[PDB]
């Protein structure tokens, strides 16, 4: 019943964990505690098998541990800066090749899976710093340029007409802009990892750069040159919605160094490169 | 069922492409690959006719390729400038003879058809540049003046009373103004092209200027003269809604030079005038 | 128009909110989903798998 299911949603009790049943002393030739990890399987022994347990009714739920929940939180993926220093025409617009590889926080979460499929919610937080005192009337234009569409080379480029591309215009003082993007891949899922090349020569590119081209985000201050200079920083936040993920993997253990690659750097003292805190010895807790 | 149809809308699966069926080897005196282009028809041969295909279920849809979708995106058609330099009374108002011919991006899309009929959604994006520091309280008036109605000659002209004409008043800080316009032609469809004149003499006008008069858009800063000068640029965006189009045509291959005419200019090196990139020879891919 | 009362919280952006928003690419039909082995629906599935403990992690 969709209404009972509804109540479970409100209470967050869709996925309940099992109870612990009462167990008793045993003397048997069946030894559940013994197994063989060589098989590649995890021994499914439970507490009732090793100790005498009491009956306990569980009230914990796994709803919050769902993939939708784990990846369904909006995190920063880019900080766009438009700093008017000495040339308005050159400094009032910019572009960014879109990716989820530049901020470690969300990158690491998505990379705990090999493939992922989801729709995207993008929320933008623009902040106008009054470097000279006044901000005037700031109007921004954020244009999504799919691969192949002409990229504007000036603040008055004809490409800004946005005759076909999607553009979002924001006016200072109005609420933060937000829009959704359908799953954009030409494949059935996004590659979080890709052990492949775009060719078969020594100069072929390796990794997700080959498969993950999502276009460019071009920004521009629509307002013409003003007396007072401003520094507009637009932070882009991304949230995955309607998510599916496949083939889990070990979490990134070292710092990221570059986009689209698993490359890392190691110091002479490797213990400083990982989160593992050195133990004094085996018996010192 | 309007609900099943509804789901198709949400999923964008209203127009599905056909499947590929499995085919087999053939030895026949029926040769579908042979035909005669002289007839003016396209040979309807499909992949199953030339190779042995496997069965594949298609999941692609043509919804996004619909005329409604193609022309249903808001693009800039005009950039109105009110630059207060040294005379508020003269520089605080302006007018524009409305047309969809000044911006190449949307003009080219509409011109891929001979006739088109649609309602129009106009969205305006005004941006006030504080040339001297402060903007004060900017209130704008955009009046739609149909052909024949009196055009204001001063910022305080009685025509601004808008006793009958539609005027849109916008206050700085408030959301972008927007309104719809019904199909305005005196004909059944708009002429994208018109091989005709408004008379039969050597001085008769030729082309769409004869048929496409949509009036004038008159703008004015309602706010009286302020100490600090501003430059208000209002960008007009147009989107076609409830669209129908007839008789498709070749896309514009060269740059546009003027409104309402197919006139073009050619340099001494014509290959620079078209998008065709010169080939080295016939066998160099 | 319908009389409305704008409540506190309006206009804010909370990273954990769950709202709807207009789609920037209307009419777009995403790629057909194919079967891929190994789908994970809940992190608990990963917590039930044995992994090695770096128990002898002395500095050396």
């Amino acid at each position: 019943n969709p209404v009972e299911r509804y109540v479970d949603e409100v209470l967050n009790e869709v996925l309940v964990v099992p109870n612990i049943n009462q167990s008793h002393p045993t003397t048997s030739n069946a030894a559940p505690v013994l197994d063989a990890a060589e098989t590649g399987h995890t021994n499914k022994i439970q507490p009732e098998d090793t100790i005498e347990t009491r009956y306990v009714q569980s009230s914990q739920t796994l709803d919050e541990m769902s993939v939708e929940s784990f990846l369904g939180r909006s995190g920063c993926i880019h900080e766009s800066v438009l700093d008017i220093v000495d040339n308005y025409n050159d400094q009032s617009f910019t572009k960014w090749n879109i990716n989820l590889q530049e901020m470690a926080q969300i990158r690491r979460k998505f990379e705990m899976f090999t493939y992922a499929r989801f729709d995207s919610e993008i929320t933008m937080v623009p902040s106008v710093a009054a470097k000279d005192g006044h901000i005037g009337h700031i109007v921004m234009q954020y244009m999504y340029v799919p691969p192949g569409a002409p990229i504007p080379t000036t603040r008055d480029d004809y490409a800004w007409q946005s005759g076909t591309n999607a553009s979002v215009f924001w006016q200072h003082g109005q609420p933060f802009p937000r829009f959704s993007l359908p799953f954009l891949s030409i494949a059935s899922a996004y590659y979080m990892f890709y052990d492949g090349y775009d060719g078969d020569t020594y100069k072929s590119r390796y990794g997700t750069v080959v498969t993950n081209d999502m276009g460019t985000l071009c920004s521009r201050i629509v307002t013409s040159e003003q007396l007072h200079k401003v520094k507009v920083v637009t932070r882009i936040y991304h949230k995955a919605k309607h998510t599916k993920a496949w083939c889990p993997r070990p979490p990134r253990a070292v710092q990221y160094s570059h986009t689209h690659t698993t490359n890392y750097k190691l110091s002479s003292e490797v213990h400083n490169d990982v989160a593992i805190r050195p133990r004094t010895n085996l018996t010192t807790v | 069922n309007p609900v099943e149809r509804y789901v198709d809308e949400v999923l964008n699966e209203v127009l599905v492409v056909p499947n590929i069926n499995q085919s087999h080897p053939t030895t026949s005196n029926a040769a579908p690959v042979l035909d005669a282009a002289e007839t003016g028809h396209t040979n309807k041969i499909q992949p199953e006719d030339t190779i042995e295909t496997r069965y594949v279920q298609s999941s692609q849809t043509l919804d996004e390729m619909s005329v409604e979708s193609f022309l249903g995106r808001s693009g800039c058609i005009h950039e109105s400038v009110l630059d207060i330099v040294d005379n508020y009374n003269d520089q605080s108002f302006t007018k524009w003879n409305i047309n969809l011919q000044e911006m190449a991006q949307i003009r080219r899309k509409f011109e891929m058809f001979t006739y088109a009929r649609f309602d129009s959604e106009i969205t305006m994006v005004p941006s006030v540049a504080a040339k001297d520091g402060h903007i004060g309280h900017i209130v704008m008036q955009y009046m739609y003046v149909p052909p024949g109605a009196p055009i204001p000659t001063t910022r305080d002209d009685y025509a601004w009373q808008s006793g009958t004409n539609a005027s849109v008043f916008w206050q700085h800080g408030q959301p972008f103004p927007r309104f719809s316009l019904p199909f305005l032609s005196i004909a059944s469809a708009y002429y994208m092209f018109y091989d005709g004149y408004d008379g039969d003499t050597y001085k008769s006008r030729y082309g769409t200027v004869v048929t496409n008069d949509m009036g004038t858009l008159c703008s004015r800063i309602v706010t009286s003269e302020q100490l600090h000068k501003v430059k208000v640029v209002t960008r007009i965006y147009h989107k076609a809604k409830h669209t129908k189009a007839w008789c498709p045509r070749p896309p514009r291959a060269v740059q546009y030079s003027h409104t309402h005419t197919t006139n073009y200019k050619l340099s001494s090196e014509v290959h620079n005038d078209v998008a065709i990139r010169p080939r080295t020879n016939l066998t160099t891919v | 128009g319908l009389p409305v009362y704008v409540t506190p919280g309006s206009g804010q952006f909370m990273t954990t909110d769950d709202m709807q928003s207009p789609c920037a690419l209307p009419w777009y039909h995403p790629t057909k989903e194919i079967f891929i082995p190994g789908e994970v629906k809940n992190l608990i599935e990963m917590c039930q798998v044995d992994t090695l403990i770096p128990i002898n992690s002395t500095q050396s």
């Binding site: 019943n1 969709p2 209404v3 009972e4 299911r5 509804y6 949603e9 869709v14 996925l15 709803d63 769902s66 939708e68 929940s69 369904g72 729709d119 995207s120 959704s180 993007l181 359908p182 799953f183 919605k241 309607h242 998510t243 | 509804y6 809308e9 949400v10 999923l11 964008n12 | 769950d18 709202m19 709807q20 928003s21 207009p22 789609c23 690419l25 209307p26 777009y28 629906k41």
Partner: peptide
């Protein structure tokens, strides 16, 4: 777009936009 249930405790699962990408977080299972 409205999924109206009844139990009375009526549920209204409204979808305000015409594209699936626009809806909020997915249900579970």
């Amino acid at each position: 777009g409205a999924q109206v249930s009844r139990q009375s405790l009526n549920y209204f699962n409204i979808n305000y936009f015409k594209d699936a990408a626009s809806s909020g977080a997915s249900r579970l299972d």
